[PDB]
C-alpha cells in the first residue's frame with residue numbers, strides 16, 4: 001500500500017515497531033536484493049566497533065540489502081551512496097548537509113546522519129541512521145531541529161529510498177561517478193586528526209580514485225587513509 | 236517509519252510492490268504472530284476454491300499471521316474479525332459497509348471487500364482484500380467509487396490495522412464478543428439462497444452462538460448454516 005515506484009531498492013520493505021538492529025537482521029536473514037529493513041526504534045543499534053547508535057522513536061533507522069555485480073575494487077564505495085543519498089534528501093527539505101569522510105553527514109558541523117556498511121557472504125548491507133524528529137546526543141542535530149518543525153517521517157523515507165535507488169542503479173553501470181558527487185559535497189581544505197598507533201594531523205585535501213582520504217601533513221608528506229577503524233576529527 | 240502503536244497486529248509489516256498472493260506468502264513463510272503481509276498488487280490473488288481475486292494497484296491487499304490461543308471451537312470466528320474490522324474502517328470514512336455473512340462486506344449490495352481465512356495448526360492466516368482506489372469487476376464497488384474521490388491508501392491501512400488489533404485483543408479474552416458486533420453490522424431479515432450440495436431459500440434471521448447463519452424456510456423449517464464451501468445469494 002506504500003506504492004513505491006523504485007526499480008530495485010524498495011521492491012520489498014520489512015518494517016518493525018522495534019528491533020535489535022536493522023543491520024544485524026539484514027545480515028542474518030535471506031533477503032532479495034533491494035529489500036529495505038526499517039524500524040521505529042532499535043535496542044541494539046550500532047556504528048563501527050559495536051559503538052552504540054542511539055535509535056529512539058522519531059528517527060529513520062534502516063538497512064538495505066545489495067548484491068553489486070561490480071568489480072571487487074568498487075565495493076568500498078557503497079558507503080558513499082548512502083552518504084550522498086542523505087545529502088540529496090536533506091536538500092529536498094532545504095537543509096544543507098556536508099559529508100565528513102567517509103560515512104557521516106553534518107549540518108553546520110553537527111552530525112545528523114551516519115552510514116554503516118557491512119558484509120555477509122556476497123551480500124552487502126547498507127545501514128543508514130538519520131535523525132529526523134527524535135532526541136539526539138549532545139553535539140548532534142536533527143531535521144526537526146534544523147527546520148523548527150516536526151518532519152513527516154514517511155516523506156523522508158520515500159525521498160531517501162528514491163534517491164538511493166537512482167544512485168545505486170547508476171553505480172552498477174558507472175561505479176566511478178559517485179566519487180565526484182562525494183567530492184562536491186564533502187568537507188575539505190580543513191585540518192584534521194587521524195588517531196591510532198602513530199596518529200597524525202594534516203589538511204584533508206581530497207579523496208582519491210579508491211575513495212581514500214588524501215591528507216597533507218605539515219612536513220609535506222602525503223598519506224592516503226582507508227577509513228577502517230580510524231578516528232577522524234576536525235580541529 | 237510507520238510508527239504503528241498496535242500491540243500485536245502490525246508489530247511487523249512486510250510490504251511488496253508486487254506479490255503472487257499475500258495469503259500464500261503468509262501461509263508458506265516462517266513469520267511471527269501479528270506480522271502483516273501487504274502488497275500494491277497481486278498477480279495470483281484468490282478467494283476460496285482458488286477463485287480469482289482481482290488485485291490491481293489502488294486496493295488494499297493484505298494478510299495477517301495469527302496464532303490465537305483460544306478453544307478450537309472458537310477458531311471459525313476469526314473470519315468475523317476481518318469483516319467487522321473492515322466495516323469499522325469504512326464507517327470511519329463514512330461509508331456504509333454491511334456484512335454479507337460471513338466473509339463479505341457490501342455497500343448498497345455491491346461487494347467492496349472479501350475476507351479469506353486459511354489455517355493449519357498453530358498458524359492462522361487472515362486475508363483481506365478491500366477495494367479502495369482500484370478499478371473493480373462488475374458486481375463490486377470501491378471506497379473511491381462510493382465517496383466520489385480517491386482515498387489515501389495508507390490512511391485506510393492504519394485505520395484497519397488499528398481496528399483489527401483491538402478486535403483481536405478482545406477476541407483472545409472473550410471469543411464470543413465478536414458475534415454481537417457481527418449481528419449489529421450484518422444484513423438480516425431478507426430472503427437469501429444457500430448454494431452448496433443442493434440449495435434452499437429462506438429468510439436470514441440471525442447468527443447463533445457458533446456464528447452459524449439461521450435461515451427460516453417458507454415451511455417454517457429452520458436451518459443452521461456453516462459457511463464452508465457454500466455460497467450465499469440475495470434474492
Ligand SMILES: Nc1ncnc2c1ncn2[C@@H]1O[C@H](COP(=O)(O)OP(=O)(O)OP(=O)(O)O)[C@@H](O)[C@H]1O
Pocket residue numbers: 046047048049051052053054055103104111112113114116131136137140141231232
Ligand atoms: N543518533 C545519533 N546521532 C548522531 N551521532 C550519534 C547518534 N548515536 C550515536 N552517535 C555517535 O556516533 C558514533 C557512531 O558509531 P561510528 O563509529 O560508526 O560513527 P563515526 O562517526 O564514523 O565515528 P566517531 O565516533 O569517531 O564519530 C558513536 O560513537 C556516537 O558518538
Ligand SMILES: Nc1ncnc2c1ncn2[C@@H]1O[C@H](COP(=O)(O)OP(=O)(O)OP(=O)(O)O)[C@@H](O)[C@H]1O
Pocket residue numbers: 281282283284286287288289290338339346347348349351366371372374375376466467
Ligand atoms: N476485487 C474484487 N472485488 C470484489 N469481488 C471480487 C474481486 N475480485 C474477485 N471478486 C469476486 O469474489 C469471489 C471471491 O472468492 P470467494 O468464493 O472466496 O468469495 P465469496 O463471496 O465467499 O463467494 P461467491 O462469489 O460465490 O459469493 C470471486 O469468485 C469473484 O467473483
Ligand SMILES: O=C(O)CCCC[C@@H]1SC[C@@H]2NC(=O)N[C@@H]21
Pocket residue numbers: 020021022023024042044045046047048053055060061062063103104113114115116127128129130
Ligand atoms: O555513525 C555512523 O556513521 C554509523 C551509524 C549507522 C546507523 C544505522 S541505524 C540503521 C542501521 N542499523 C544499525 O544498527 N546501524 C545502522
Ligand SMILES: O=C(O)CCCC[C@@H]1SC[C@@H]2NC(=O)N[C@@H]21
Pocket residue numbers: 255256257258259277279280281282283288290295296297298338339348349350351362363364365
Ligand atoms: O471474496 C472473499 O471473501 C475472499 C477474498 C480474499 C482476498 C484477499 S486479498 C489479500 C489476500 N491474498 C489473497 O490471495 N487473498 C486474500
